[PDB]
């Protein structure tokens, strides 16, 4: 019921700013603090900041003071994280949550990757990973979708919407000499019912505002 | 600032054992006034957010499994799973709560050992779609395997391919604890309609002797 939905994902160019929002629901907004932290892979957890929306007080972890601000709307619920001066090491995820006075943040986004790059946006192209009778196993079949040559991530992707969770597997995207990246997603089904069933890849790459839905069929040859 | 340290970085154990962690802060994390001792568990999955385990040391927030209990004072603090279940493959990470900064130690990645299944393989062409664009990419999937170390080498006529692939490896899976792998070999439109046969060919610590996978272009 407490929900914190972050903006999408971005690419920003060095000594450009990001403002990363955190959309509140389910509480009452200026009775809590909003904590933000990153995380690099690798690197782990670091705290940026904290702020209670109910008079905009905000706590910053020195190590970010002067290149984070937070600021919270109480018209809209919405608390915001601007991080300027951006540089290849800012490039992580990005967490806001939520912490009640004396608990622990709780609640915590999605997160939100930054990637700061002077390389611009490219969008996926997306292909079908047809089943066949060469991906088949004892009344089984798998079937997917290939990401192709995107850049920034993350690509996300899931399956009919959500309501086919089962048997996916969504691979971490590669790196192309490019520089771009790709990925895959496969979902293993019955092959019983490859006929009467619909099988649609849903591929979002927010950075680029790409939204691309694939329906994956057997085909005929 | 307090600096939290975790151990060890990783561990591997079987279901149902006993698993425990430590964490240790370069301070002391136990308040006077209310003698709560301010440490905070997360567990973390590859791609998710951190999830709120345990506060105050050992308050377990509503929700979490009694499976999972903190535990420890002052600057010394440890985190027990005292049955591991497969979903609790994770990293646990401490936070100092104390005092401003908050800072968190590295973490503890906890895996999963379990029997050895062998790979199931499969061969996707290159789509119609995809040809048009001026290029062939061909997909080879490694489905549910254990231990993770799969090794696929492509195969085109019978000759192995160097320098045209790229592969990746999944997390460990939360329900069954195996892996699964996707190698893609990519080749312009004009190479791939010069060849007739492409396998991707399999060795795993499952199997006997290689599988292979393959489809004739065209056929």
């Known amino acids: 019921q407490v929900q914190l939905v972050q903006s999408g994902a971005e690419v920003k160019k060095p000594g450009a700013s990001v403002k990363v929002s955190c959309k509140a629901s389910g509480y009452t907004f200026t009775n809590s603090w909003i904590g933000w932290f990153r995380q690099a892979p690798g690197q782990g957890l670091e705290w940026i900041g904290d702020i209670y929306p109910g008079g905009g007080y905000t706590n910053y972890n020195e190590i970010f003071k002067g290149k984070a601000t937070m600021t919270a709307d109480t018209s809209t619920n919405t608390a915001y994280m601007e991080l300027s001066s951006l540089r290849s090491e800012d490039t992580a995820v990005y967490y806001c949550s939520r912490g009640i006075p004396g608990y622990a943040m709780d609640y915590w986004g999605q997160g939100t990757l930054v990637t700061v790059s002077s390389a611009s946006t490219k969008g996926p192209s997306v292909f079908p990973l047809a089943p066949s009778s060469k991906s088949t196993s004892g009344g089984t079949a798998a079937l997917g979708c290939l990401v192709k040559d995107y850049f920034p991530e993350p690509v996300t992707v899931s399956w009919n919407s959500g309501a086919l969770t089962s048997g996916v597997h969504t691979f971490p995207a590669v790196l192309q000499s490019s520089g771009l990246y790709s990925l895959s997603s496969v979902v293993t089904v019955p092959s019983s019912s490859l006929g009467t069933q619909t099988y649609i890849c849903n591929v979002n790459h927010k950075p680029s505002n790409t939204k691309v839905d694939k329906k994956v069929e057997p085909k005929s040859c | 600032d307090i600096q939290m340290t975790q151990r060890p970085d990783s561990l591997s154990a079987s279901v149902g054992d006993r698993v425990t962690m430590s964490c240790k802060s370069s301070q002391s994390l136990l308040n006077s006034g209310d003698q709560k001792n301010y440490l905070t568990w997360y567990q973390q999955k590859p791609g998710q957010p951190p999830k709120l385990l345990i506060y105050?040391?050992?308050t377990g927030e509503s929700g979490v499994p009694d499976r999972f209990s903190g535990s420890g004072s002052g600057t010394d603090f440890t985190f027990t799973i005292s049955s591991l279940q497969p979903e609790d493959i994770a990293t646990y990470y401490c936070q100092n709560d104390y005092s401003y900064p908050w800072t968190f130690g590295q973490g503890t990645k906890v895996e999963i050992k379990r029997t050895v299944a062998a790979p199931s393989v499969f061969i996707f062409p290159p789509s119609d779609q995809q040809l048009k664009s001026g290029t062939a990419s061909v997909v080879c999937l490694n489905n549910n395997f254990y231990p993770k170390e799969a090794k696929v080498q492509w195969k085109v006529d019978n000759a192995l391919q160097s320098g045209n692939s790229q592969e990746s490896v999944t997390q460990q899976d939360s329900k069954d604890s195996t892996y699964s792998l996707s190698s893609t070999l990519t080749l312009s439109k004009a190479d791939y309609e010069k060849h007739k046969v492409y396998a991707c060919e399999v060795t795993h610590q499952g199997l006997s002797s290689p599988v292979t996978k393959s489809f004739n272009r065209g056929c």
């Open positions: 105050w040391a050992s």
